[PDB]
Amino acid sequence: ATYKVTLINPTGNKTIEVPDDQYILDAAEEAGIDLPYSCRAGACSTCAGKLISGTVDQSDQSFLDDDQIEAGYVLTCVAYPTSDCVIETHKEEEL
Numbered sequence: 001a002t003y004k005v006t007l008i009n010p011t012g013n014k015t016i017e018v019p020d021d022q023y024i025l026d027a028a029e030e031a032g033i034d035l036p037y038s039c040r041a042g043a044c045s046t047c048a049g050k051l052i053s054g055t056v057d058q059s060d061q062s063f064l065d066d067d068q069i070e071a072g073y074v075l076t077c078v079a080y081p082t083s084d085c086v087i088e089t090h091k092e093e094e095l
């Protein structure tokens with residue numbers, strides 16, 4: 001499956017089609033979108049986003065606790081989309 005991911009940043013928004021076995025971050029860059037990143041391994045906060053709608057699989061992540069997750073945070077470097085979704089990006093400091 002290839003899923004629509006809408007990325008909302010401070011000043012505007014962009015939809016991209018992300019295959020379900022590619023990380024949101026990887027696809028974003030592939031599309032010329034510059035997101036923040038650091039470790040790229042699910043172990044810091046630098047790349048975090050916030051799901052507003054849809055679902056992701058970020059099973060490869062280790063930084064977010066069970067309540068950051070439930071509240072919708074996502075480490076975009078390690079998340080695959082599991083449906084069309086919408087994510088507010090540059091959410092690092094909320095952690």
Ligand code: FES
Binds near residue numbers: 038039041063076
């Ligand atoms: S860049 Fe460190 S968690 Fe994604």
